[PDB]
Each structure stands twice: as structure tokens, then as C-alpha cells.
């Protein structure tokens, strides 16, 4: 009964998240294909994704529970197809800004993917359900990264054909959503829900902040003329590390009623100490291992939060609660980026940035580690 919805949902997730063209976006757009300058791509195109994402997250989390979810997953599929068609055949700066608007729609509509399954499945399959859905996306990301690396180097695959492969992947994914079963017909009062959302809001803002500077840190630490190959490979392995960590959450029989918070504290410290290790250590392998632990550890927690939010939601407000938490994370991340990295703010170099990111994650652990009064 639960197998068919889960199978179709994870097939859609795998085929949508498998996109070879993603790691070569900047080389593609600034390359000989589109000829967009670095200043343009960085300041006029890319920001439209953040504002489009921020604005579109509002209707998504406002309505996704009303429309019963499937309409939102289908909309995400169509947005995927439009985005990649424009990427393939769209030339100019305004066209790329529209591409970024539709990608903001695509990512903002992802709340329905994780929200959808708890409406069609019984509460007793929520743990297993949560693990597969997160892992297939990360397994798909790793597979796409490996395929792109092999093709671009071994197959001399041009970025246009990576884009074509990703377009075919998202088209197949769109075809998989038409068959998804349709579900049928101030909520933070619970403290588990409140704290799981608090960690989601703040940890998520920090996580997406690191990802844009890991490769910059690795280059500064160990200047290597072939860093690009190693930077991609470690990203993929770190992404595969969280796929099995996410998968292992749904399989292992552990009483999550008592291990909910305990896991939050233990892996919150591993997210802090892992970041200090990349900042302080001189070996790049120690820095590579730090990223693997940080990304794998975070994805272990993001799986428990979604599972542990859905369990304590009395009302079927899955997209509201998930949608708010990824929106407040967007606000936090955008504010923090301005303070820390932006020239308008402090303009910290990557040398010290991870002491900020490292301690920023220690503060998160500090709040959760100190909730025991006697």
C-alpha cells in the first residue's frame, strides 16, 4: 500500500535531481556558448535566483497543503523543463534572469516533494519514508556529478550535451509525476516541532553558506594546478556520504522518542568541530575529511528533523511547517552573507570565514546542549 507512492515519488526525485550540467554552470554561461561576463553572471543573473526563490517560497508554503501537493510537484516538473529549455536555447542576460526566476520556482516548489509523502502514507512508515526520499536525491546528485566528471574528461562531453542530458532527465522526471497518487482531504505549539524547526532554520542557513566557499578554502589551503578534479570528487563523495547517512536513518531500529534530542546535540558538535578542523588543519586531506563529516553529519540530521516534524504535526500542515523553515533560513542566510562576506559588511577572507562558520555552528550546539535545568 505504501510501496507504490514511495516508489513513484523516489523515481521522480532521483530523475529530477540527476543533472550532469549543474557543476559546470559557470563555465557553461561564461564560456564560448553564451559569452556572459563574470560581472554579469555574478551580479545581474545569480541574485535573481535568491530573490525569486525568496518570493516564490511564499505562495508555495501558503497553498501547497490546499492544492493537495501533487499540483505543486507537477508545477516543479514543468519549471524544470522550462528552465533547461531556456538554458539550452536562451541567449542574453534577460533570458538568463528568467532562467533564474524559473529555477527559483523549481527550488521553492521542492517543499512539496518532502511534504507530499506523509499525506499518502501511514504514520508507521514515516521513518523509512523519510530516509529514502532524502537519500535518492543525494544519490542522484552524486551520480550526476560522477557522470559529468567522466564525460567531460573521458568523453570530452561539451557542456551543451550535459545540458541536454539533464533536460532529458528532468523531462523523464516530469513524466513520473503524472502518476503520483493524489492525497485525500501557529501550529508550532509542540516543543519538538519548535526546536527541530529552530535547528532547521539556523543550521540550514549556515550549511548553504559553507557550500559556496569550501572549494575556495581548499584552493587557498593547498594551491594545486589540478584542484578542479579533486574539488569535484570530494564534493561527490561528501554528497554520497550523506546519502548513506540519510539512508541509514530509515533502516536502523532506534527509538527516536528518546534519541531525538540526543542525536541533535551529538551531531551538532560534530558539525562545529568539523568546521574548526577545516579552518585550522594544514593537511588538505584533513580538510577534505572535515567536509565529508560536516556534510554527511548535517544530512543525517535534516532527515531526522523532517521525520520528527511530521510525527508531531497534529494537522496535515506539512508544507506550511517545512516551507516556513526553509524560508526563514533564506532570510538568515541572506542577512549573514551581507554581514560576513559582502564588501558592504566585513569582507572577511576565506582564511577566517570558517572560524565564523565553525563558531556559528558551535552556538547552535550551545543552545541545544544547555537545555537541562535542575
Amino acid at each position, epitope marked *: 500500500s505504501w510501496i507504490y507512492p514511495t516508489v513513484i515519488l523516489c523515481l521522480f526525485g532521483f530523475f529530477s535531481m540527476m543533472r550532469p550540467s549543474e557543476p*559546470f554552470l559557470i563555465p557553461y554561461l561564461s564560456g564560448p556558448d553564451k559569452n556572459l561576463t563574470s*560581472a554579469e553572471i555574478t551580479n545581474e543573473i545569480f541574485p535573481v535566483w535568491t530573490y525569486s526563490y525568496l518570493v516564490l517560497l511564499l505562495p508555495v508554503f501558503v497553498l501547497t497543503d490546499y492544492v493537495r501537493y501533487k499540483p505543486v510537484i507537477i508545477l516543479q516538473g514543468i519549471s524544470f523543463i522550462i528552465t533547461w529549455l531556456l538554458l539550452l536555447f536562451g541567449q542574453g542576460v534577460k533570458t538568463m534572469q528568467v532562467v533564474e526566476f524559473f529555477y527559483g520556482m523549481v527550488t521553492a516548489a521542492e517543499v512539496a516533494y518532502y511534504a507530499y509523502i506523509y499525506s499518502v502514507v501511514s504514520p508507521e512508515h514515516y521513518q523509512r519514508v523519510s530516509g529514502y526520499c532524502r537519500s535518492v536525491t543525494l544519490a542522484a546528485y552524486t551520480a550526476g556529478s560522477v557522470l559529468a566528471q567522466l564525460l567531460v574528461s573521458l568523453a570530452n562531453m561539451s557542456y551543451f550535451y550535459l545540458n541536454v542530458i539533464s533536460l532529458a532527465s528532468v523531462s523523464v522526471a516530469f513524466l513520473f509525476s503524472l502518476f503520483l497518487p493524489m492525497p485525500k482531504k501557529e501550529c508550532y505549539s509542540s516543543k519538538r516541532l519548535f526546536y527541530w524547526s529552530l535547528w532547521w532554520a539556523f543550521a540550514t542557513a549556515g550549511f548553504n553558506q559553507v557550500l559556496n566557499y569550501v572549494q575556495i578554502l581548499w*584552493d587557498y589551503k593547498a594551491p594545486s594546478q589540478d584542484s578542479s578534479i579533486y574539488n569535484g570528487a570530494v564534493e561527490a563523495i561528501a554528497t554520497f556520504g550523506g546519502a548513506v547517512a540519510a539512508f541509514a536513518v530509515g533502516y536502523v531500529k532506534v527509538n527516536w522518542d528518546l534519541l531525538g534530542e540526543l542525536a541533535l546535540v551529538v551531531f551538532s558538535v560534530v558539525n562545529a568541530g568539523s568546521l574548526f578542523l577545516m579552518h585550522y588543519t594544514a593537511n588538505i586531506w584533513a580538510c577534505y575529511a572535515g567536509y565529508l563529516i560536516f556534510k554527511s553529519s548535517y544530512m543525517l540530521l535534516i532527515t531526522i528533523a523532517v521525520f520528527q516534524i511530521a510525527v508531531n504535526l497534529n494537522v496535515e500542515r506539512y508544507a506550511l511547517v517545512f516551507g516556513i523553515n526553509t524560508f526563514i533560513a533564506l532570510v538568515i542566510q541572506t542577512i549573514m552573507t551581507v554581514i560576513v562576506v559582502d564588501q558592504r559588511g566585513l569582507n572577511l577572507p576565506v582564511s577566517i570565514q570558517f572560524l565564523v562558520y565553525g563558531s556559528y555552528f558551535a552556538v547552535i550546539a550551545g543552545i541545544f546542549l544547555m537545555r537541562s535545568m535542575y
Partner: nanobody
Amino acid sequence: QVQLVESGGGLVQAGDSLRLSCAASGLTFSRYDMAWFRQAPGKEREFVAAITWTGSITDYADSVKGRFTISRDNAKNTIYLQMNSLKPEDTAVYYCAAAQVPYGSTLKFNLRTLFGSWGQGTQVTVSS
């Protein structure tokens, strides 16, 4: 306003060598991929070299390769270009350019579309 100042150019008989310097200012020099371009008298500006911000990589044009040694001195916010065995076909106005985005190399921005913030160039007249 990123300000760059090319110095070093001048007449040099063929076979001698030169060193130009470009003491960049107004930017965080230790984060930007600097470069050197030239504009021969009757053509368009053409990439010559580009030293990544880490300094571990130095791309070069096919013609110059093997004679040009781009460098950088982050202490002095300066970059150099040693030009050895100069042939009359190297004559140009040598402009130093700064990456319009700090970590261009790490984010994999095409080099020949990554450098702006031009200077006012220095004249090299390789006189056979």
C-alpha cells in the same frame, strides 16, 4: 574604483628582455586573478597571461608561451611580466587587468571573459 598602473614599457632592441609592473590599488589584491593584455597597433586587445589568485597557475597565449613569466607580489599589490627574447611582433600597449569577480579561477570562470578594470597601458616598442 580599482586603480591599476602599468610601468616598465619602452623601446628594446630585439632579443633583449623586459619587466613590466602593475601596482594595483583599490582592491583586495590577494583574492583576484590578475592578467596582462595587449593591443597591437591595428588589432583588438588580446589575452597574454593570467596568474591565478593563488599563484599556482599561469595561463599564456600560444605566441608568448616560453618567454613570458607572469608573477605577483601580494605584499606590494604588484604583478609583473618578464618578456625575454622579444621579437618585433610583441609590440603593443600592455594593459594589466583585474578579475571582475574575486575568486574567478576557483569558480571556473572562462579566463578570456574574466578580466576588466583595465588600466592605461604601457607602450613596448620592440625595435629590430
